[PDB]
Amino acid sequence: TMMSGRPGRVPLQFLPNEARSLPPPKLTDPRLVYMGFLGYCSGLIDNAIRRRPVVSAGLHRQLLYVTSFVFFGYYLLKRQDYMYALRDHDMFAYVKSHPEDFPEKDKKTYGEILEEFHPVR
């Protein structure tokens, strides 16, 4: 799946307009919480490197790190969900438009299938 050549794709569009039809990630999304945790860890390591009280040196700096991480994570998650939605839409459309390549398998019950039995001895 190389989607660079997809027809009707704006070159440098981070989030296309049709992505607005997808549900946005919730503000309490676990991945957003993880990005905020990453920002908090970045703040702690920043305090540790510059030889400052790790937990309580700069509250504004740690808050800025967490907020920026959450912002970028929200937009990145939006783009991720949009790209996966595009992949699924393309796969379903291709399956619909090529019936001969995806035949409907005849439903068969185990009572009429013969599976070889290997005893455990």
Ligand X SMILES: CCCCCCCCCCCCCCCCC[C@@H](O)O[C@H](CO[C@H](O)CCCCCCCCCCCCCCC)COP(=O)(O)OCC[N+](C)(C)C
Among 27, 96, 97, 101, indicate the residue that binds another protein (CB under 8 A).
27
Whose Cβ is closer to another protein: residue 17's or residue 103's?
Answer: 17
User: For residue 102, what is the enclosing H or E element?
Assistant: none
Cα→Cα distances 114→33, 87, 106, 107, 117, Å: 51, 38, 16, 15, 9
Q: Which residues contact 49 (CB under 8 A, 6 or more apart)?
A: none
**What DSSP character marks residue 22?**
S
Q: Which two tokens stand for residue 111?
A: 């009572």
Structure tokens at 32: 């957003």
Taking the complex as a whole, the smallest distance from the CB of residue 4 to ligand CDL amounts, in Å, to: 19
Cβ-based neighbour number of residue 73 at 10 Å: 20
The binder of 28, among ligand CDL, another protein, ligand X, none, by C-beta within 5 to 8 A per type, is none
DSSP single-letter state for residue 11: T
Find the shortest distance in angstroms from Cβ 13 to ligand X: 6
Tell which one of 7, 11, 23, 111 touches ligand X (CB under 6 A).
Answer: 11
Subset of residues 62 to 91 that bind another protein, contact rule: CB under 8 A: 63-64, 67-68, 70-71, 74, 76-80, 83-84, 87
| Interface ranges with another protein (CB under 8 A) | 2-5, 7, 10-12, 20-24, 27, 31, 34-35, 38, 41-43, 45-46, 48-53, 55-61, 63-64, 67-68, 70-71, 74, 76-80, 83-84, 87, 111-112, 114-116, 118, 120-121
